[PDB]
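Need a sequence for this fold. Nothing fancy.
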């Protein structure tokens, strides 16, 4: 041809080729922003039979992709506001002129395919036209951000064995992923430099995250306006370094941060991008920047399509990053190669740890001090990465995962997520299954809240809002026993007993108490006598509610509720 592929580019091509020689279904490739997505595009098109349509939502993406294609010495058409195998188009423009797209189309590539579900509405008109004309039309997505915290995952199965999204995902498969780690190790991107000790960080250890997992507009703009005096004190140091840098990208937390920054540095040498802007004004600021007509770009919406020019060489991070994906997306905005760019200066000011390579758990943290931890599935061996708390030594205090995420395929094409359940109910189903996939048969499972309300309107019933438990142990002519006593904030209490002597009794005790009560399900608790259990009571959680029925004379435990989540 006219071009030569790097090894990783040929991997991405062969991955795609193998997927569609076996499957009709959509696939995504995960490529960082400096990878040269045009080299994959051009090899697929050299091999294609139809034409190939390369769609973007953002017209500047359509123009960037058309330019980078023809920079290879190749011809292709473009369809936007104003001949070869490939057509480069925007969603709006192509959904308009569908009559001009009536030939053979074998492959449709969607750049930034994470955008697809951001309503838009014309896209599926395109999809259905192309599929009417081309029933076996193959669709490849490309993206650097498969997962946005708050929107979830763009694919379902990953070819490494994890499951990510539900049956809902737009792409059933992710078939190649190029790690930042590797692109930096082999020099295909600019190596990043995070200043070891920058002077005055913010104190975002006060993290009050919403349920989708994103810190709220209010909580940000307010909650550390207690330090809103340091907002000029830090831009001073940013200007210090920017003395010797071509383009600085600064990421605020809110418009109330980004404006209180855009005024605080030089007077017309900076600009402000956020979703609340034109339009024609963004089309002016994309020409001004990258052409370097100003220096500082301040933004709060990290979607920087157009401003990730190669000349940017310092990323200053003025916001806490909830997921690692947001951190990686932000640093990656400044990692492109430029002739004589030695590194990219990363200024981590907020409470943002040092893991450009962290695994993305893929769900909200929960407790703010939660880190990723890896738990091995006792069924299939797969290495899950759940949220957890780990001690100084790297040892596991808690992990929070509920189900193994590995998957497998037989030789009949039937594909299944592993079904090992770290948290369970009954005899077993997910903590939040409505119907028992299979037992007490397909019956309707009793919702915790209803079970508590039923038990409340019983007289022979006790319902204690458990504030903790205490263990005693003892012995007689049949061996040892362990007695657990649950109690609420007023010392109302109720207890149960477990003989530890016989192997059936040992086994029942692992079944009915250690497995519900352990903080590290899947990692077995090692113990010889009740004394070892007392010794390890920190590895045990206490129930959120206990229900005891009456007969006879004494109170007898019947139900324990863990992992509550619905108030009350
Ligand atoms: N196979 C290749 N042969 C020659 N140059 C390449 C190759 N792959 C990538 N490059 C160069 O590496 C850089 C890739 O950056 P870019 O084209 O901006 O990535 P993307 O378009 O994927 O965002 C470009 O400067 C490009 O010319
Ligand atoms: Mg490219
Ligand atoms: Zn498993």
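Here you go.
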């Amino acid at each position: 041809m006219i071009f030569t592929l790097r090894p990783y580019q040929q991997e991405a091509v062969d991955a795609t080729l193998n997927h569609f020689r076996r499957h009709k279904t959509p696939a995504v490739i995960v490529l960082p922003t400096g990878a040269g997505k045009s080299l994959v595009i051009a090899e697929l098109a050299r091999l294609a039979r139809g034409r190939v349509l390369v769609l973007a939502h953002v017209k500047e993406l359509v123009a960037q992709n058309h330019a980078k294609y023809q920079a290879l010495g190749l011809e292709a058409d473009i369809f936007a506001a104003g001949h070869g195998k490939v057509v480069f188009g925007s969603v709006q423009s192509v959904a308009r002129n569908l009559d001009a797209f009536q030939g053979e189309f074998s492959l449709l590539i969607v750049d930034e395919c994470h955008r697809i579900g951001d309503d838009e509405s014309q896209y599926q008109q395109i999809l259905t036209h192309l599929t009417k004309v081309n029933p076996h039309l193959r669709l490849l997505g490309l993206t650097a951000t498969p997962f946005r915290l708050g929107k979830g995952w763009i694919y379902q199965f990953h070819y490494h064995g994890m499951v990510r999204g539900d049956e809902k995902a737009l792409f059933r498969d992710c078939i190649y992923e190029l790690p930042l780690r590797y692109m930096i190790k082999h020099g295909y991107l600019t190596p990043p430099e995070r200043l070891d000790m920058p002077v005055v960080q913010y104190d975002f250890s006060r993290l009050q995250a919403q349920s989708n997992g994103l810190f709220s507009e209010a909580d940000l703009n307010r909650e550390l306006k207690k330090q809103q005096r340091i907002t000029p004190h830090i831009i001073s140091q940013i200007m210090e370094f920017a003395a010797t840098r071509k383009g600085v990208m600064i990421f605020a937390a809110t418009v109330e941060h980004a404006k209180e920054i855009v005024g605080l540095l030089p007077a017309e040498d900076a600009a402000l991008i956020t979703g609340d802007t034109p339009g024609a004004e963004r089309d002016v600021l994309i020409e001004n920047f990258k052409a370097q007509r100003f220096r500082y770009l301040v933004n709060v919406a990290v979607l920087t399509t157009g401003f990730d020019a190669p000349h940017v060489d310092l990323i200053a991070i003025l916001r806490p990053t909830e997921s690692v994906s947001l951190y990686q997306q932000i640093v990656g905005r400044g990692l492109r190669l430029a002739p004589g760019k030695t590194d990219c200066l990363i200024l981590d000011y907020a409470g943002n740890p040092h893991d450009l390579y962290a695994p993305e758990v893929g769900t909200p943290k929960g407790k703010s001090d939660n880190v990723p931890v890896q738990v091995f599935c006792p069924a299939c061996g797969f290495a899950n990465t759940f949220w957890g708390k780990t001690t100084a030594d790297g040892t596991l205090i808690e992990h929070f995962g509920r189900r193994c995420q590995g998957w497998f395929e037989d030789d009949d094409g039937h594909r299944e997520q592993c079904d090992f359940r770290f948290r369970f109910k009954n005899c077993q189903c997910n903590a939040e299954n409505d119907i028992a996939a299979r037992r007490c048969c397909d019956t309707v499972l009793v919702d915790p809240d209803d079970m508590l309300k039923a038990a409340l309107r019983l007289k022979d019933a006790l319902v204690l809002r458990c504030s903790g438990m205490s263990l005693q142990h003892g012995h007689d002519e049949k061996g040892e026993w362990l007695k657990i006593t649950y109690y609420d904030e007023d010392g109302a209490d109720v207890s149960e007993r477990f003989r530890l002597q016989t192997p059936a009794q040992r086994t029942a005790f692992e079944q009915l108490f250690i497995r519900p009560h352990t903080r590290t399900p899947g990692i077995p608790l090692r113990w010889i006598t009740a004394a070892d259990i007392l010794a390890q009571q920190a590895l045990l959680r206490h129930p959120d509610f206990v229900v005891a029925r009456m007969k006879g004379q004494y109170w007898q435990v019947r139900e324990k509720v863990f992992d509550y989540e619905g108030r009350f």
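For context: The longest helix spans residues 503-517.
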